[PDB]
């Protein structure tokens, strides 16, 4: 709790810093690697591929103006011709809207049967509550009540 309130004080103070600066002079404000580690969930890695491709990313700003003013185009050739994809299969798994994938992606992968990760994995019964037939919603609802 003292930490909770400590956060609001810092929040208002940064508001006074930014607001003040304009007088002295949004969501697009540049970010820090701890702030970067703050957003994304567990289990991901940061990559450099090169130092050189990274220098391309740094020149990219300057080259977003520069290389957009330069030669470029795309074309296709006529030639004869694998196609993987995932819905939510198991037995049934009522359908996923194209956005909801972000939430339910963990259910899509078929890796199965090896603790908590299996409780989150089995907790996708939510999906059965959200979308599905009314009976699936009923039975799912009870099953999650008793659990």
């Amino acid at each position: 709790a003292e930490t909770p309130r400590t956060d609001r004080g810092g929040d208002s103070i940064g508001e006074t810093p930014t607001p003040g600066a304009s007088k002295r002079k949004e969501r697009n404000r540049p970010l820090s690697d701890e702030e970067l580690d703050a957003m994304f969930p567990e289990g991901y890695k940061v990559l450099p591929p090169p130092a050189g491709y990274v220098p391309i990313r740094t020149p990219a700003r300057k080259l977003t103006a520069t290389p957009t003013p330069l030669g470029g185009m795309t074309g296709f050739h006529m030639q004869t011709e694998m196609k993987s994809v995932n819905d939510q299969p198991s037995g049934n798994l009522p359908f996923l809207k194209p956005d909801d994938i972000q939430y339910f992606d963990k259910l899509l992968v078929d890796v199965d049967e090896s603790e908590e990760q299996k409780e989150r994995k089995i907790m996708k019964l939510l999906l059965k509550i959200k979308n599905g037939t009314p009976p699936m919603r009923k039975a799912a609802l009870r099953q999650i009540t008793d659990k």
């Binding site: 600066a21 289990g43 972000q102």
Partner: protein
């Protein structure tokens, strides 16, 4: 002239397990400078990645042209990544030093 829900972060999927960050930086590097990019190295998250740009409109042109764009045999899933959700793994702190600095250097 933009929908509010879109954000500088894009969730990208339908990636191979062999895929190289060279192709990543090259391809995605069209629209703007990369803030950075993460890739799942973990058993479930392998095949997924997150891209973050110095500007949103970068990402907007990206999902515009990169929509269902192709790599190898695959058509990548390109979505605007959500916010909040799982955050509090990290904390709010370390504001004191930087704020003391801006209060020191410029004196404001």
């Amino acid at each position: 002239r933009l929908p509010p829900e879109v954000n500088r972060i894009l969730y990208i999927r339908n990636l191979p397990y062999k895929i190289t960050a060279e192709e990543m930086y090259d391809i995605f590097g069209k629209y703007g400078p990369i803030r950075q990019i993460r890739v799942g190295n973990t058993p479930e998250t392998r095949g997924t990645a997150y891209v973050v740009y110095e500007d949103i409109f970068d990402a907007k042109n990206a999902c515009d042209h990169l929509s269902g764009f192709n790599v190898c045999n695959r058509y990548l899933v390109v979505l605007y990544y959500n916010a909040n959700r799982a955050f509090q793994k990290m904390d709010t702190k370390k504001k004191e030093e930087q704020l003391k600095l801006l209060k020191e250097k410029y004196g404001i």
